[PDB]
RNA sequence: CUUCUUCAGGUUGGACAGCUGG
RNA sequence: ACGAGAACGCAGCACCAGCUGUCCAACCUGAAGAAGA
């Protein structure tokens, strides 16, 4: 629980909510690139992320330990390190991760260590995902 | 009655079946091969095999052009390749199958990994500026033995599904698998063609084997 | 059908064609030239020639005269090399392969490697310093055997193909293929032109094979 | 499971954090030539070098064998040659060896002689490719 | 797949170990031109024989074959003999294949008579081509 | 009797994206 | 000596058929193996 997304913190009751104002800020003055934008980020940009963070969430859904193992953190980690190599490899994603911060539940699952920290994780990225479609898609 | 189709595919030149380019590890090539995931070994996909040998056929089948649907191929193609029209669905006679390369211990004993990176650049014409980029072949001189199972549904046009069978293997020979064929990529060949009875005898397996090795 | 055109590119000067610096042995020279991964052989890659083809005749199409896209040239050069157009793409022609050294014996045994490391340096004019530079060259006399497949999409249009086609390679004659060709390197030389026919046989190929060879 | 680069220590979590630092030293100290001149490592420079690490993975995770192979501890000496030739060849090049550890690395893979170490190898590799694209990129 | 430069040479370690030490040594004391004189190898005085080794293993690499066959045996002849030819030269890459034994691995390739041993040699040449430029190297 | 063993510049762009049938 | 006793919501059924991860693109640009007196 409480998990902390840089300015605002997040819980069981709370992920969806900033999901759909994060997906909607988005879509409110979008991405610029150098040459004046204007286009928005596609699911086949963060897919691997996404499938990453889906294989650590069903590894961790059949442990009921209350604390991550190193084996698990360790694929968190290359999560991040993910995060971080699309992040640079396109600004489109950058941006996107940055705004809807990724990088920083990442960071505070990597500090808390615990199982419920990294569902309330995964349901704050589906939520991401959802409200990303049916207000943009692709 | 059910038949196997043995052969090899040899890469003349390098191949390039375009990959998933998202989970192929950080810091890899810019448009990697599509590999097997297990064994990482690069594969040529049954699908791309299928719709490139299909297209050949039809093509060439018709009257040397192609312009319909899949679905409105000739009799020959939709009983070879299968059909999903509404009052004729034809189940295909042919299985492709996902073809991995076999030789890479005859590709480690030259000290080659079975994959290069080709370099290429683009040059803009009105700048007189290139524009390098990075592909991931498939180096040529892989070997990728493969398996066609055929049902021998009727007993009565096996030899001109077979004479079909060849004559699209035989276009893929002037033509490419998958990727930049154009720009000197995926061109193949075709050797060991063997036809075989997966369960039992049959009694013209002689007759195709020499249609399929000529 | 899949008219194949066929031929040799001799080297009258020593060619150039950029491969990576890495891949190779080490403390080879500074910039090698692009070879075959598992047999080490020079290379002529099909993009390569493909691209230089494509920007001579687009060139002469044109009138000396190329500021634009490779999809807004001609309608011969997109016909012939393809296009990417939303409004319509034009499946390529001309189908290139990467082009291996294929006179090997005969350097064999006149005692001379594949390729020749070139030695050449800068030298500036405000100060008499020379800048060491080391390149490599496929030696000159080399053969590079080639084959490009065509496709007759329509038969009208195919003895102006050919025809363009010939044109294209007269074109490499009075110009360079790869690297270096401002500064004496890259001299290529057609010869032995020919087309066969790839399945079966096709009428008035003797026409195309007689605009081919002169 | 661990591996050596001398005061600090990566193991199979710390990895993308300690790829982050070494990145972000090098970014925030640039490495200045000979000529008074700032210059930014390219991608391409170990291009070569980040392909016989990957050459080398595939045909480790294809082993599942706690002893690496004679061949494949050739491979990997090869490897640390290669980085070794391209350090020389460049100084920019030799400087990110230097900040970082690659060559620190390898040689605690060749020491160990197991599997596990040079995955963790490859994963602080591709941690710190991950984290050069991320600030400055090719 | 073992030659003596000394002491021994195998495939998976120490092919670049003692090219490690090699160089090491050669930077400990270089080599002395003249009385009153100081002197330092460039990697220009070894080009000719890398061009042969090179050359040599390009058309060795494709046989399936262990023994070399008479022709790259005279090949090698001829490597020992630009060997001696750029060694007499200048004497400064005299003392450079003295302290490297690369003359002891040619004569080790020649007595084997095996694929291996060349490629080996090859593996070696290149080890010290490497750390030489990573050390010192113009 | 002389030193430089390479220096400088580009480092991916555009297009398609699920449609039919039960 | 319970509006109760006994009673499988059970049997047969392939989430399946058709479909190329394809198209366009030069590894390219400039450089005296050269100079004291």
Known sequence: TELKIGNEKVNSTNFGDFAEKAIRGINHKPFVNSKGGEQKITTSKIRGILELVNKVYNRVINTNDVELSENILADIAYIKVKIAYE??????????????????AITDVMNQR??????????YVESL???????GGK | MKLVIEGTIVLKTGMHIGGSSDFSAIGAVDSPVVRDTLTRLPLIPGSSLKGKMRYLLAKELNNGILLNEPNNDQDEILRLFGSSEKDKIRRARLKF???????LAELETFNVSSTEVKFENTINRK???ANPRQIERVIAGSKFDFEIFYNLDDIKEVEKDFENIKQGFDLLEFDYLGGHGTRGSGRIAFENLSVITAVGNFEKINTLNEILGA
């Open chain 1, 87 to 104: 992040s640079g490899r396109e600004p489109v994603v950058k941006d996107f991760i940055q705004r809807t911060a990724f990088t920083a």
């Open chain 2, 127 to 129: 700048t007189a500026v």
């Open chain 2, 97 to 103: 199958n996902d073809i991995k390369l076999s030789n």
């Open chain 1, 129 to 135: 995902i959802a409200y990303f479609k049916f207000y």
């Open chain 1, 114 to 123: 615990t199982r419920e920290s990294f569902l309330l994780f995964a349901r």
